[PDB]
């Protein structure tokens, strides 16, 4: 277990996060941790940002997954590419891996105009697809999820219920 790799995985787990909006109506993002968790609200918010930041209705939602693709044993696992077609493919897709191996993957999920239920179903298939490399229960495989559109910032999805 390399010190640099293990510390980064320890640090990302230690990033604070909170549920719901704070009491203050106007507050800085620095003063409070992340708040937005629900995937259904995330898809609606990504469409909302399309209206506010005037752009094309159809956007590629390149989900970024901070997957713990290591620390199964003292010997870390190696990157691969498991290709599984999504139930609602956008108009088999390879699961790319980071060049720097910083345990974050950039994979397109669905177009922005696609319904949230279809997008959520596509997300669930990816969760099982990425974990297929190391389906062992000895070590956690998913740490954080950031669903971002082409012209929007990611949101810390509550992927913990969707892990099994």
């Amino acid at each position: 277990t390399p010190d640099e790799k293990k510390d980064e995985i320890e640090k990302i787990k230690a990033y604070p996060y909170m549920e719901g909006e704070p009491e203050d109506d106007v507050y800085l993002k620095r003063l409070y941790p992340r708040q937005i968790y629900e995937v259904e609200k995330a898809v609606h918010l990504l469409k909302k940002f399309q209206i506010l930041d005037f752009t094309s209705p159809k956007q590629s939602v390149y989900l970024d997954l901070t997957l713990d693709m290591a620390l199964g044993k003292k010997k870390n696992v190696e990157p691969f590419t498991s290709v599984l077609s999504l139930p609602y493919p956008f108009a088999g897709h390879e699961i790319k891996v980071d060049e720097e191996r910083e345990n974050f993957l950039q994979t397109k999920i669905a177009t922005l105009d696609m319904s949230s239920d279809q997008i959520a179903a596509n997300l669930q298939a990816v969760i099982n697809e990425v974990c297929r490399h190391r389906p062992l229960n000895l070590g956690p495989f998913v740490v954080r999820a950031f669903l971002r559109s082409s012209t929007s910032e990611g949101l810390l999805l509550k992927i913990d219920p969707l892990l099994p």
């Binding site: 009491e23 203050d24 109506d25 106007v26 507050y27 800085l28 003063l31 005037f54 752009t55």
Partner: protein, 202 residues
Amino acid sequence: TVIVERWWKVPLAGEGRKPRLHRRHRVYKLVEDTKHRPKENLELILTQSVENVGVRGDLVSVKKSLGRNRLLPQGLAVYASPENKKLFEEEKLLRQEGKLEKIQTKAGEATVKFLKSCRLEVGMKNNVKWELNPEIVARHFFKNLGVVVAPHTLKLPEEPITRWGEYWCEVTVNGLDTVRVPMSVVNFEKPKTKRYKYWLAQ
């Protein structure tokens, strides 16, 4: 504090008798030096408004170095004694009953200080016709300034904006402090494009 114990057992002395100490009882082994223990925070009640600690009447756990050197000597905070705790608890109860707080929570004061000295770049794209509404304006606070602003708290100048220029935005925090921030409507640029053009070159 250095804590040590004797290597050799001291024979019992009994009731009302001092123990008999041989020269071998001077042998000590180090148990623990308290200076190496993890540091604990100090519980204090603030009397004034601090930049980051908080505001008057708030139970704040701060580092012992900060409290003993800055807050206590300068009167910014007092000990969280039961007497002091009850006093401030009654103070806030009366303030709630009298509706005279106007002091903002710990986060709210920092937001106001940031909002006093800040400028928002509302990047609007030239191709698609755009109308500025408080929902759109609050979006740019989250992106550019990194501020989460409720849409209802924003008060636009009520004049529709379709051209690039300078305007003003009134931001209200907790319904108590109203901050008028400058507004700069500039043509939108992609952050990956904008950072390359300006930050990388200069």
